[PDB]
Write a protein that binds this ligand. Structure first.
Ligand code: M4I
Length: 293
């Protein structure tokens, strides 16, 4: 009933019709917090696309599903996953989007050791995406390795906008407790009204993923890790001796407890650490299909 009501709402904003009419060979390739991801073949072309399928009845905040169509309509960009169409299919929202065949950054940080050229490439690409989003008041709010996808040729794109929000003159700060515990900014855990700064903190934690292979406190259960992030000084690299002074200096601009003193995306784009960034090709050897070839 509220379900039926919500379906009818989603229909108002999505494309008409049914992509099963033009896609074949759905194969499940992963699951996130809002739904599953399949690849599919476009029948006419043989081209591959990704289809995110999000059940309207299995969301913590089902109104956040509108984030998909806000981003799709308004905030497309070369470092954001291309989103082609959205549909209401039975009790699910489907988004047909680009297939990022280089996979998620998670697989790389789990199995591989990135060098600083590679790390600098990912950070530069993400910061390009964030500078543009933040300038328009869009906060991603779930920055972590799982949200960073790669093309086959090593180009970096943000994905998983399901938890994003907008700030504006009339709504200058957000308050919602949103994100993934280990990556959450301390002001957000503290329930202080917050802005785009929270994404810069989360990026800092992703740098720690890239250097150490996991976020701080990853062995603690989530409710307990958030307490630690809230209460303690900024987390430290397990492997400080393994990072250049340039990278440590960069990281120290991200993991600042006071949001007003944290570097902004625009400022971070000028950091000397990012001069180390290799081209997309530098990332390609880390990918599953290449690293044991
Ligand atoms: C883990 N996340 C996803 O699987 C995903 C999410 N949104 C868009 C996508 N395009 N291509 C993929 C996979 C190939 C990584 C995705």
């Amino acid at each position: 009933s509220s379900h039926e009501q919500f379906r009818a709402a989603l229909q108002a904003v999505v494309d008409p019709g049914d992509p099963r009419s033009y896609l074949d060979n759905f194969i499940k390739i992963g699951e996130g917090s809002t739904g599953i991801v399949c690849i599919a073949t476009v029948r006419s072309s043989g081209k591959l696309v990704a289809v995110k399928k999000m059940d309207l009845r299995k969301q913590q905040r089902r109104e956040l599903l509108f984030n998909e169509v806000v981003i799709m309509r308004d905030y497309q960009h070369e470092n954001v996953v291309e989103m082609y169409n959205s549909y209401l299919v039975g009790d699910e929202l489907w988004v047909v989007m680009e297939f990022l065949e280089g996979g998620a950054l998670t697989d790389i940080v789990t199995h591989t050791r990135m060098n600083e050229e590679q790390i600098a490439a990912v950070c530069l690409a993400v910061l390009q995406a964030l500078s543009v989003l933040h300038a328009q008041g869009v906060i991603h709010r779930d920055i972590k390795s799982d949200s960073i996808l790669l093309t086959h040729d090593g180009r970096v794109k943000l994905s998983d906008f399901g938890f994003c929000a907008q700030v504006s003159k009339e709504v200058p700060r957000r308050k919602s407790l949103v994100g993934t515990p280990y990556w959450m900014a301390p002001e957000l855990i503290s329930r202080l009204p917050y802005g785009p700064e929270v994404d810069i903190w989360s990026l800092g934690i992703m740098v720690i993923e890239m250097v150490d292979g996991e976020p701080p406190y990853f062995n603690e259960p989530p409710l307990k890790a958030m307490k630690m992030i809230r209460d303690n000084l900024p987390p430290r690299l397990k492997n400080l001796h393994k990072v250049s002074p340039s990278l440590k200096g960069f990281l120290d601009r991200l993991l600042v407890r006071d949001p007003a003193q944290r570097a902004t995306a625009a400022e971070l784009l000028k950091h000397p650490f990012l001069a180390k960034a290799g081209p997309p090709a530098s990332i390609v050897p880390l990918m599953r299909q290449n690293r044991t070839r």
